[PDB]
Amino acid sequence: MKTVVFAYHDMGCLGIEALLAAGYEISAIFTHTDFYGSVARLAAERGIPVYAPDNVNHPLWVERIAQLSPDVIFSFYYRHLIYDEILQLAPAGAFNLHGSLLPKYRGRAPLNWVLVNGETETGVTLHRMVKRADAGAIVAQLRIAIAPDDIAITLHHKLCHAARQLLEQTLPAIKHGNILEIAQRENEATCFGRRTPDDSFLEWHKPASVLHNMVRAVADPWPGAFSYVGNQKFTVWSSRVHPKAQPGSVISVAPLLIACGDGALEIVTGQAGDGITMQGSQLAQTLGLVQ
């Protein structure tokens, strides 16, 4: 079975490796220019043509892809719209690997949003690509638990591991033909957009648990959850939730505890502005905080 692949990031790399292990002939890989593996380097190393146009929804690319005559198309964490004029070129269809328990968390950054929302589980889904983005029928879905101490990076590795497990068996299954797919129920779908810097802004009137989840959701290597001490921005890299004061006020400086709408949030590590990461107690002194 020959295929044209759209891929990026660790998921893109493992998807390409899985296709290769399943005997697929990858005619070309479409990716993006830039801690994760490089799909371009993997393609370059495997001798697979690789392209990184900013936008493929143009006849120039439709024709180039048509000439490659893919039987099937795969999208593994490609970040841009691949329009139907391209996807319809593959008689066996197009399939996308999405990092959530679809229909929940369609859209962008499901890895981060499930942590923001304090979900206790998430998963990977391989689904048919239809007109409507992330809504096509499910070939297979594999759930993973989210542990209280998982942060974006540890959950990312778990998702990649699940993706490897899922693809290892589903790719050969697709090679044998159409699989009876599971329809997504629109009434159960949720969709998220790309996260803006504002989406990681800590608002102290919220419950400490919610803020703690935000810290976990964008912990290093992600940008970090942030707030301000007056006009000084600071980032909270790691935190701890604790069980009678104005929200946002300092309860203690060592450890650094901030009163929230409910409970308190201990800033275990963080940084002031673009300064270096330090323990919360030191950050408190750096920011001029006092009980």
**C-alpha to C-alpha distances, 35 to 50, 56, 75, 221, 266, nearest whole angstrom:** 21, 26, 21, 8, 28
Resolution (Å units) = 1.7
Closest listed residue to residue 66, CA positions, set 56, 52, 55: 56
Pairwise CA distance, residues 192 & 215, whole Å: 18
Rounded Cα distance between 181 and 102, Å, is 13
For 107, 198, 232, 285, the CA distances from 289, given in Å and listed in that order, are: 39, 24, 12, 6
CA–CA–CA angle 176, 48, 69 (5° rounding): 50
Q: Annotated catalytic, 98?
A: yes
156 is in an annotated binding site: no
Q: Quick check: 96 and 181 in contact, CB under 8 A?
A: no
Question: Shortest CA distance to 155 belongs to which of 212, 103, 105, 219?
Answer: 219
Q: For domain 197-291, is the CATH number 2.60.40.10? A: no
132 annotated binding-site participant: yes
Q: Which residues pair with 128 in a beta bridge?
A: 95
**Residues ≥6 apart with Cβ < 8 Å to 147:** 154
| Domain range annotation of the chain | 1-196, 197-291
Terminal-residue alpha carbon distance, the chain = 66
DSSP bridge pairs for 272: 234
Checking DSSP bridges between strand 94-98 and strand 72-76, what pairing results, if any? parallel
Question: Which of the following is catalytic: 32, 98, 156, 212?
Answer: 98
Strands 225-229 and 138-145: unpaired
Is 131 annotated as ligand-binding? yes
133 is in an annotated binding site: yes
Rounded Cα distance between 158 and 155, Å, is: 5
Report d(CA 241, CA 191) in Å as an integer.
28
**Residue among 14, 17, 13, 11 nearest 39 (CA):** 13
Q: 119 near 112, Cβ under 8 Å?
A: no
Residue labelled with tokens 């502005």: 273
Name the CATH superfamily housing domain 1-196.
Formyl transferase, N-terminal domain (3.40.50.170)
HEC letters along the chain: CEEEEEECHHHHHHHHHHHHHCCCEEEEEECCCCCCCCHHHHHHHHCCCEECCCCCCCHHHHHHHHHHCCCEEEEECCCCCCCHHHHCCCCCCEEEEECCCCCCCEECCHHHHHHHCCCCEEEEEEEECCCCCCCCCEEEEEEEECCCCCCHHHHHHHHHHHHHHHHHHHHHHHHCCCCCCECCCHHHCCEECCCCHHHHECCCCCEHHHHHHHHHHCCCCCCCEEEEECCEEEEEEEEEEECCCCCCCEEEECCEEEECCECEEEEEEEEECCCCCEEHHHHHHHCCCCC
82 appears as a binding residue in the annotation: yes
> Cβ distance 58 to 86 under 8 Å?
no
134 is in an annotated binding site: yes
Method in brief: X-ray
Tokens of 231: 């006009």
